[PDB]
C-alpha cells in the first residue's frame, strides 16, 4: 500500500491562468519581492509582496512561487472580485 505522494497538483484562481500570470494580464508594471523566508523540520513558510496599481499585498505559502500565488490572489479578490454590490467592506 502507498499512503504517500509528492504534492505536484497546482491550485490556480478565478480563471485557469494561475494568479501570478493572471494578475500580470489584468495589470502591468507589477512587483514581486520576498518578505519572509524559512524552512523547518517538515514545513516551509515563505511570504511574498506584490505591487498592483501602486498597492502592496502580502501572501504566505510553502515556497516563494506559491506565496506569490496567494499574494496575487490577495490583490485579485480586492481589485477584481467581479462580485455584486458591497454590503460589507473594510478596504
From Swiss-Prot:
Location relative to the cell: Nucleus, Nucleolus; Cytoplasm; Nucleus
PTM statement from Swiss-Prot or TrEMBL: This phosphorylation results in the dissociation of ILF2 from the ILF2-ILF3 complex resulting in a cytoplasmic sequestration of ILF3 where it can bind to viral RNAs and impede viral replication. Methylated by protein arginine N-methyltransferase 1.
Phosphothreonine PTM sites in chain numbering: 83
Domain DRBM: residue ranges: 15-81
Tissue and organ expression note: Ubiquitous.
Subunit structure: Identified in a IGF2BP1-dependent mRNP granule complex containing untranslated mRNAs. Interacts with FUS and SMN. Interacts (via C-terminus) with PRMT1. Forms a complex with ILF2. Can also bind to PRKDC/XRCC7: this may stabilize the interaction of PRKDC/XRCC7 and the heterodimeric complex of XRCC6/KU70 and XRCC5/KU80. Forms a heteromeric complex with ZNF346 and ILF3. Found in a nuclear export complex with XPO5, ILF3, Ran and double-stranded RNA or double-stranded minihelix VA1 RNA. Found in a nuclear export complex with XPO5, RAN, ILF3, ZNF346 and double-stranded RNA.
Function: RNA-binding protein that plays an essential role in the biogenesis of circular RNAs (circRNAs) which are produced by back-splicing circularization of pre-mRNAs. Within the nucleus, promotes circRNAs processing by stabilizing the regulatory elements residing in the flanking introns of the circularized exons. Plays thereby a role in the back-splicing of a subset of circRNAs. As a consequence, participates in a wide range of transcriptional and post-transcriptional processes. Binds to poly-U elements and AU-rich elements (AREs) in the 3'-UTR of target mRNAs.
Name of the protein: Interleukin enhancer-binding factor 3
Organism, scientific name: Homo sapiens (Human)
Gene designation: ILF3
